[PDB]
Amino acid sequence: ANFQYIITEKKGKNSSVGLIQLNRPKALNALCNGLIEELNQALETFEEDPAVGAIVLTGGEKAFAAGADIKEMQNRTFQDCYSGLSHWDHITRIKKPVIAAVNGYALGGGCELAMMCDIIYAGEKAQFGQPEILLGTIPGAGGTQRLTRAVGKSLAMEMVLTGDRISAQDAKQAGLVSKIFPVETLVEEAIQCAEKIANNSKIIVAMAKESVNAAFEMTLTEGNKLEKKLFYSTFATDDRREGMSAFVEKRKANFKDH
Amino acid sequence: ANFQYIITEKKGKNSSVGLIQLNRPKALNALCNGLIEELNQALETFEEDPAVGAIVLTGGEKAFAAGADIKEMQNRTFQDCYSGLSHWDHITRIKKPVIAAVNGYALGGGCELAMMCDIIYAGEKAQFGQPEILLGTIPGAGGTQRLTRAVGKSLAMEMVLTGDRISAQDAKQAGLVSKIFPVETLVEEAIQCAEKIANNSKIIVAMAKESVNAAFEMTLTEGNKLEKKLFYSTFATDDRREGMSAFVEKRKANFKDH
Amino acid sequence: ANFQYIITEKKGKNSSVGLIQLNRPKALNALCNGLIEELNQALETFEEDPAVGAIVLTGGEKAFAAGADIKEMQNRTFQDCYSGLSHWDHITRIKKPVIAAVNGYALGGGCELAMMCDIIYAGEKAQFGQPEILLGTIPGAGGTQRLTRAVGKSLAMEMVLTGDRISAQDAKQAGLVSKIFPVETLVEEAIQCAEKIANNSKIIVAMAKESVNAAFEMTLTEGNKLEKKLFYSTFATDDRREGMSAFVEKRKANFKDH
Amino acid sequence: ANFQYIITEKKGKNSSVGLIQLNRPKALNALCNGLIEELNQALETFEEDPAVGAIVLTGGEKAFAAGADIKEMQNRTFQDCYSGLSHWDHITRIKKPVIAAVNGYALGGGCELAMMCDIIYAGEKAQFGQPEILLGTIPGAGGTQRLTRAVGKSLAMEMVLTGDRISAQDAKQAGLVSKIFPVETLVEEAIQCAEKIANNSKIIVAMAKESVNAAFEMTLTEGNKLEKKLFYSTFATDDRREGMSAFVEKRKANFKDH
Amino acid sequence: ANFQYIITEKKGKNSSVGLIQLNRPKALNALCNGLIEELNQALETFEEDPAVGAIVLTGGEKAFAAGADIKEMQNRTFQDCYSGLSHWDHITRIKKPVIAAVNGYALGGGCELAMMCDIIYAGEKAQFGQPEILLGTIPGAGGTQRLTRAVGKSLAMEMVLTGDRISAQDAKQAGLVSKIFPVETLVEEAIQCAEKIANNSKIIVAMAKESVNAAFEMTLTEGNKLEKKLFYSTFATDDRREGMSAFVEKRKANFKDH
Amino acid sequence: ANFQYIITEKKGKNSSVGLIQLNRPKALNALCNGLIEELNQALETFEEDPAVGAIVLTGGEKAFAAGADIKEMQNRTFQDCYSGLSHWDHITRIKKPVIAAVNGYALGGGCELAMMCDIIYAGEKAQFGQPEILLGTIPGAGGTQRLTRAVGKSLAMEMVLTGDRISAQDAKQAGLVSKIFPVETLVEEAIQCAEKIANNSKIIVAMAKESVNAAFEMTLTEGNKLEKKLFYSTFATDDRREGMSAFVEKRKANFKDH
Ligand SMILES: CCCCCC(=O)SCCNC(=O)CCNC(=O)[C@H](O)C(C)(C)COP(=O)(O)OP(=O)(O)OC[C@H]1O[C@@H](n2cnc3c(N)ncnc32)[C@H](O)[C@@H]1OP(=O)(O)O
Ligand SMILES: CCCCCC(=O)SCCNC(=O)CCNC(=O)[C@H](O)C(C)(C)COP(=O)(O)OP(=O)(O)OC[C@H]1O[C@@H](n2cnc3c(N)ncnc32)[C@H](O)[C@@H]1OP(=O)(O)O
Ligand SMILES: CCCCCC(=O)SCCNC(=O)CCNC(=O)[C@H](O)C(C)(C)COP(=O)(O)OP(=O)(O)OC[C@H]1O[C@@H](n2cnc3c(N)ncnc32)[C@H](O)[C@@H]1OP(=O)(O)O
Ligand SMILES: CCCCCC(=O)SCCNC(=O)CCNC(=O)[C@H](O)C(C)(C)COP(=O)(O)OP(=O)(O)OC[C@H]1O[C@@H](n2cnc3c(N)ncnc32)[C@H](O)[C@@H]1OP(=O)(O)O
Ligand SMILES: CCCCCC(=O)SCCNC(=O)CCNC(=O)[C@H](O)C(C)(C)COP(=O)(O)OP(=O)(O)OC[C@H]1O[C@@H](n2cnc3c(N)ncnc32)[C@H](O)[C@@H]1OP(=O)(O)O
């Protein structure tokens, strides 16, 4: 469509990386309903596009996304909430992998949106935080849940109770993010990692992703049994036969996505 | 009351931080029943004090606490356990946040009491450990559970099976504690974090704390749903209206704990 | 027996440590059905030897193990999977502690084998990875489950979806391994950790290992209650009464394994 | 809208109950994609109607519904499944209560659809079953999960593994259904149970329905604590003050749904 | 003490049974704060009385208990709940078994109190219900959790969403209660069950009770393992050795509660 | 082999049902190690037999099994249990369905062995119980877990804490067993049900069985998703195509176990 709040581009080898860029820089990309509706639309389009194997989500160089728009919630009631932040986690239902390339601020709903991605790459000056407590509320889209599971009780409690930000280097050391890149090459490096993934078999990559996600939803006993079943499933695909022949016949693999 | 084994003080801005100091230096604050009874009293008194928004728990410079009291345990039988270990985890039922400021030894029951706190700050010479195995027993107040969830299986196995101590630095790197301070300022630094948590609304802070804790008790799916209900609940308070107004109007929020 | 693929030896003080070494260096220790079978036999023999209190598992300098054997798997089918990698987790059923000493490559099934040990020590040049996705399959023995639980979602997703390796240093920082040592002393350092475990009471150590393992199978509430029960159980042993009388009596405990 | 497969109607005191009637009896209400989409829209419409407080779902007199449409499924593949039957559980996302009035056959997808409702009333000649196994497949929409949790392992295994049907009386005795009525008054009796529900506050009913559904997603300890939060949240509503004043003042309650 | 709203007595063979009778019949046993505090005291006194091995909780003939007390809840606010019905589940922490003998009404808080006992015996005219919804609130002490787990989703949803009562016979058929007896001998029949329990070893009974309770708190795999460790623990008591010796020696066991 | 304690035969149409009869009538089939060992061999042999699709497990007319062997357990110690019950749950790892046909007593370990089967059919004079508590021990092979999940808390507590037996009719009413047959035809009836099961595809039957068992190990969300995956799996098989072709061609299906 004609997007007012984001820009999308297809990037990388063979146009296989979908790039979604939040673009509301005077508001440092605060998450408003308008922008969320567009993000959701773009994610669905990329998800349905057969040439796209992975998505990179990024913002501007000073901010991935600072916050939601407070003015937009300022006047709601308990009843309003309860009976009526609904479309905020559509990103968790995409099957293809999604990499957040975070430069600058990722705060509040912004930190949450990044944690919902499968992988996070941070720029050198990135900063993460959940300042919701400073506004008299608490994180409402996994900020108390995905953060704690990544960084441990002590650091998550400190962040959620004080609102204090942490640096890209603290995030990486704690495992909230897995690489740090220079500011000017962040998105390009995220695009390469996405390309590498997109070169894999899509149906296998989707099973792997589902398998890793399952580790937050099951005991280890049941997570292993699920994994084992996804693993048996891969033997029903041509890609599995091809990847393994390629290694025996010492050649490169040619996946076809089934 | 007139405490035999602890000292309590009110501190920080407006006396908003309750300080509790273990004070049985002759036994390196070994946690005998009597001391635990006084601790639980001091915590309840803080909890009920409307001036108090956070608590700091600390020992002396040489030990936070060197464990449960081995002398009191020596002569117990399997059958004493059964029909008889009891008020050891009252601290987990306090709604207000509790920060452990650990200088020196925190071993066995003492490491466990620190890990039950929301946040741990460590002094430069602090040491953590679970030496229970060296007495022919295992950790009995979360030392195999909270430790493992903070530092990973490999280090928690190594600590629990050998009894080896780790440093403050190793504890920080592993996410068991979140900051390290010089010995002589640790307690002051912990009070400053406490005072920051105490400036926020007491009822919102209690909710946020409940939400974070819930990351250890449910799948990520039901944790996100429970957080969302608590987020909705915030919109039932005056302090949520006041915080959101203050952000929009760009002024200091004046929270009144409801 | 007469082993083709591994070498076993008894080591440490009084020969209390069973060492198992994978020995199929022309395939970089690839884990074929034959070798898994021997490995399982060697594990059962050490578990049954009353002289052995802990096991070290290791490979060569260049590789701990490069994976399941891709040539045996090549012509498997979805129905073969279903109706017939079955003894692949026998190691998780050994009650005595097992430490992986990983030099060089630990990839795919080899990374998984290491992650199933209680403790991992890594050599300076070690590398961990899950390159299954490059063959059109996913990790099938815990590599989406135990990895995620040790290193966090972001790093696990990146490793499983790209197949990229991580260094020993990255692995320690993320808590997948708990110590790093020079290539040449690695095994010796692992035998020392093992010998220390072996000096402790075998019954309490088996309990303490169970308890730590429970942290991935239950909520924190229930894990604490199971631990408490096993902690009560220790009071049924001679070793528990000795270990604590020793401390009180200012003398060396002498453990009898009961 | 112009519905092919279902009929809808408002019923009961003040048009408070929305009635959805599946209406493809030349195929015994076999649930083809077409019918599901229609079903799903009707559910949404009643969900958004501020006059309706409960929905009654029902089929014809001889079949509630005899499964998904075996002819639509005949030629699908394993890769079709993976990459491409999907809106089957929209009903689980409706917040208002939904009662299944089941006359005649409710088999396979049909039995699943009824088990996804909150309440099931059965006509005297109703029959429930999961005959998937007779087609070479297994239940795919909760038939091995919701059935087993309602009837116990022995009866579920017998049903799933043989395909045998059970009677309305066996279903009530086992707790899969909760009342039995004559074939010819079943719908009207469901409607009167729905109107009783619709007389209660709509926000409170939604909270209660969520509490009860959480019994299948959490341990009891966590389900109690979630329940407790929803219970406290009711005190933020006018409806609660109103129901409770009306008891005290011995008068009827007048609820406003907030 | 000198009780205002309850009566206690010791009954059974050798006065081995503590009987607690709720006694506020002019409010049908509405559970005000005051009565809750005396119940809790009486429970604690039987728990510590070494002559008592099991407790029987009953009410009057027309009512066991009609609920929490609506006049004391009437003016509470959301902030009251929050930063404030707290000692309501002390009965769940008593180690000795508690049997509810329910004659007459057990509604709302009163149904919940009975579901918190280990065993419920119902008189012929008893009725069970959760009418909270009719007051614009939801059950707040396990009514949506313990009821659903006993009777299945359909019947719990119907009860919680309509407020309708069910009979003693429906409750027994659904497994909410496990015996029905005549109104006039109900309490003596419950005493008989408690005396039988009290003749058994207290320590093994307590462990059996904990093992049954674990069935609502973990997966079947882990509850089997918890149970196995409790079963090994029994072999530390004299009573277990006595119990089996007596079977093999063809004589009566004499238990000694250890 | 030459079994001392059991008898096996193949039965039903096409000899498709493996019948294992416990045959140690002078001890009422008390389950000593020797008998468990033979039991497990007989089950493995039927598991591996491509003509067998289901197994019927039975005892004699007077006792299915009266428990673990009290004579063998008498002189065990705490410490024996630690290091040394072990192959007691091999039956739970069989993929083919197992039906217990219980005539007469099934008590203690014998009630537990029946509950470990997928389906229980009971003779008219069968009796179920957990009399462990009368020997000073608790159930140790699922008696506090599988029982409670089948019959609800109240009846399970009453059985486990008193040792009282329940009839066949009480068991069927509570959902512990799914059908009652006359004593002299019970085995023939169970074999007929096994024969139906064995008419279906063995690979689809095994997946159906694994799905149903999953209901005890996962929240409903994750149980539904695992089931979905299994459902997709079936589309990789020939039997799924054949069964669904057969309905539509209105002929009888010809399954080939793949
Ligand atoms: C449910 C919870 C269960 C918890 C279970 C547990 O925590 S089991 C407990 C686990 N923790 C312990 O095993 C650590 C035990 N303590 C030590 O190992 C050591 O004290 C230490 C390395 C920390 C410090 O050695 P030092 O030589 O500096 O100090 P020293 O040992 O002389 O201690 C000073 C005095 O405190 C006493 N003391 C120290 N630790 C104690 C303890 N846990 N229980 C009782 N008393 C203790 C001593 O015995 C000595 O008293 P006297 O010389 O005057 O007698
Ligand atoms: C349930 C579990 C499922 C597990 C599934 C898995 O683990 S799937 C497995 C995942 N792991 C594998 O993908 C890693 C494959 N291996 C490699 O990429 C590479 O070998 C390497 C990166 C380790 C290093 O390569 P190098 O070039 O240094 O060494 P090179 O490739 O010459 O390998 C040395 C010899 O070992 C053999 N070999 C190496 N890895 C093997 C493996 N995993 N399975 C079988 N055979 C293997 C190769 O064929 C060459 O054998 P010949 O020259 O005699 O033929
Ligand atoms: C993800 C979710 C997955 C769900 C997957 C599933 O539910 S698998 C589906 C499971 N359910 C099915 O097995 C039930 C199949 N139905 C039956 O076995 C039988 O129809 C019956 C026992 C229900 C009733 O038999 P009767 O003899 O009275 O009626 P009869 O067999 O003639 O059926 C009446 C008409 O309905 C059609 N029909 C009935 N059930 C159907 C189904 N599931 N798919 C499509 N068509 C069906 C038939 O083809 C016939 O139409 P025509 O004569 O015009 O052709
Ligand atoms: C955390 C936990 C939360 C728990 C929350 C709850 O249990 S909420 C509460 C839920 N339970 C209630 O909704 C049930 C309320 N009660 C009723 O519906 C009805 O009393 C009844 C069907 C039980 C019986 O009706 P009867 O007509 O036979 O008796 P009747 O209504 O005249 O009342 C007898 C006297 O008892 C008092 N009474 C009855 N139930 C009460 C209650 N739950 N709390 C306060 N007082 C109660 C009434 O005021 C009247 O006193 P006066 O003569 O002085 O006026
Ligand atoms: C991990 C799993 C742990 C499991 C733990 C358990 O199952 S503990 C086990 C729990 N189950 C038991 O408590 C039930 C024990 N048995 C009884 O209560 C009773 O035998 C009975 C009520 C079923 C039937 O009484 P009757 O008098 O008809 O029959 P009787 O008692 O004479 O049994 C006939 C013969 O078999 C023997 N016998 C019966 N049950 C036995 C058992 N569980 N272990 C060993 N031997 C047993 C008797 O000792 C007797 O042999 P001799 O006369 O030669 O002596």
Interface contact F82-E232, CB threshold 8 A? yes
Count CA atoms within 13 Å of residue B241 on its CB side: 9
What CA dihedral angle connects F227, F228, F233 and F236, to 10 degrees?
150
Beta carbons within 8 Å of A157's beta carbon, 6+ residues apart: B97, B118, B119, B209, B212
Ligand nearest to the CA of E68: 4
- Give chain C positions within 8 Å (CB) of D221: 219, 221-222
Helix (H, G, I), strand (E, B) or coil at D41: helix
Q: Known binder of ligand: residue A152?
A: no
Beta carbons within 8 Å of C31's beta carbon, 6+ residues apart: C65, C67, C68, C69, C109, C110, C113
Annotated binding site of B: 68-71, 109
CA gap E103, F97 in Å, rounded: 44
- The residue among C56, C119, C225 with the most chain B CBs within 10 A of its CB, best to mutate, is C119
CA gap E112, E149 in Å, rounded: 13
Name the active-site residue from B38, B132, B189, B195. Answer: B132
Length of chain F: 258
Beta carbons within 8 Å of E246's beta carbon, 6+ residues apart: E252, E253, E254, F135
CA gap B151, B130 in Å, rounded: 13
Ligand nearest to the CA of B143: 1
Solving technique: X-ray
| Paired residues of F22 in beta bridges | F6
CA gap B178, B192 in Å, rounded: 14
Name the active-site residue from B12, B67, B109, B129. Answer: B109
Interface contact C79-F258, CB threshold 8 A? yes
Q: Known binder of ligand: residue D109?
A: yes
Residue written as token pair 């599971």: A149
> DSSP alpha helices (H): ranges in D33-166?
33-48, 70-73, 78-83, 109-116, 146-151, 153-162
CA gap A215, A223 in Å, rounded: 6
What CA dihedral angle connects E153, E156, E157 and E163, to 10 degrees?
170
| Nearest CA distance, E106 vs chain B (angstrom) | 30
Interface contact A258-D79, CB threshold 8 A? yes
* B250 alpha-carbon distance from chain centroid: 34
- Residue B234 main-chain phi, psi, to 5 deg: -50, -35
Q: Determine if ligand 1 sits within 6 Å of the CB of residue B239.
A: no
CA gap A93, B189 in Å, rounded: 43
CA of C67 to the centre of ligand 2 (A): 7
Positions of chain breaks in chain F, given as the residue before each break (C to N > 2.5 Å): 84
Q: Are D192 and D12 in contact (CB under 8 A)?
A: yes
C-alpha torsion sign, points A81, A83, A87, A91? positive
Q: Determine if ligand 4 sits within 6 Å of the CB of residue E18.
A: no
- Give chain F positions within 8 Å (CB) of C207: 82
- Give chain F positions within 8 Å (CB) of B219: 219, 221-222
Which one of D5, D26, D28 would you pick to mutate in the ligand 3 pocket, going by the greatest count of ligand atoms within 8 A of its CB?
D28
Q: How many helices (H) and strands (E) does chain F have?
A: 11, 10
| Domains delineated in chain C | 1-200 (3.90.226.10), 201-257 (1.10.12.10)
Q: Which helix (H) or strand (E) holds B78?
A: helix B78-83
Which one of C5, C23, C28, C144 would you pick to mutate in the ligand 2 pocket, going by the greatest count of ligand atoms within 8 A of its CB?
C28
Q: Which atom belonging to ligand 4 lies closest to the Cα atom of E62?
A: 28
Q: Which amino acid is at F137?
A: T
Q: Which helix (H) or strand (E) holds A54?
A: strand A54-58
- Give chain D positions within 8 Å (CB) of A236: 78
Q: Are B199 and B54 in contact (CB under 8 A)?
A: no
CA gap E237, E42 in Å, rounded: 29
Q: Enter the tokens of residue C64.
A: 């701990």
Beta carbons within 8 Å of D2's beta carbon, 6+ residues apart: none
C-alpha torsion sign, points E47, E52, E55, E56? negative
CA gap D32, D37 in Å, rounded: 9
Beta carbons within 8 Å of B154's beta carbon, 6+ residues apart: C118, C119, C120, C150, C175, C176, C177, C178
Interface contact A235-C81, CB threshold 8 A? yes
Q: How many helices (H) and strands (E) does chain E have?
A: 11, 10
Q: What is the resolution of this structure in A?
A: 2.1
DSSP summary character for residue D235: G
Is-catalytic flag, B112? yes
Residue written as token pair 């045996």: C72
- The residue among D93, D210, D221, D229 with the most chain B CBs within 10 A of its CB, best to mutate, is D229
Which of B117, B154, B147 lies closest to B131, judged by CA?
B147
Q: Are E203 and E239 in contact (CB under 8 A)?
A: yes
Q: Determine if ligand 4 sits within 6 Å of the CB of residue E109.
A: yes
CA gap E69, C54 in Å, rounded: 61
Which of A202, A197, A242, A207 lies closest to A228, judged by CA?
A207
Q: Enter the tokens of residue D70.
A: 């075996």
Q: Are D229 and D214 in contact (CB under 8 A)?
A: no
Q: Which helix (H) or strand (E) holds C63?
A: strand C63-65
Helix (H, G, I), strand (E, B) or coil at E115: helix
- The residue among C79, C217, C218, C219 with the most chain D CBs within 10 A of its CB, best to mutate, is C219
- Nearest-CB residue to D71 (from F224, F228, F248): F248
Enumerate the active-site residues of D: 68, 109, 112, 132
Interface contact B241-A149, CB threshold 8 A? no
| Nearest CA distance, D82 vs chain C (angstrom) | 15
Beta carbons within 8 Å of F30's beta carbon, 6+ residues apart: F24, F65, F66, F67, F68, F69, F70, F71
- Give chain B positions within 8 Å (CB) of D236: 233, 236
Q: Which atom belonging to ligand 2 lies closest to the Cα atom of C27?
A: 36
* B179 alpha-carbon distance from chain centroid: 14
CA gap B183, B170 in Å, rounded: 17
Determine which residue's CA is closest to atom 8 belonging to ligand 1: B132
Residues of A near F (Cβ–Cβ under 8 Å) read 214, 217-219, 221-222, 226, 229-230, 232-233, 236
Q: Are D207 and E52 in contact (CB under 8 A)?
A: no
DSSP summary character for residue C133: G
Burial of D62 (0-12, 13-18, 19+ CB in 10 A): middle
CB neighbours of residue A60 within 10 Å: 17
Q: Determine if ligand 4 sits within 6 Å of the CB of residue E180.
A: no
Which of C46, D95, C99 lies closest to B153, judged by CA?
C99
Helix (H, G, I), strand (E, B) or coil at D1: coil
| Paired residues of B105 in beta bridges | B63, B127
Residue written as token pair 């796209």: A52
Interface contact F83-C237, CB threshold 8 A? no
Secondary structure (H, E, C), B144-175 = CCHHHHHHCHHHHHHHHHHCCCEEHHHHHHCC
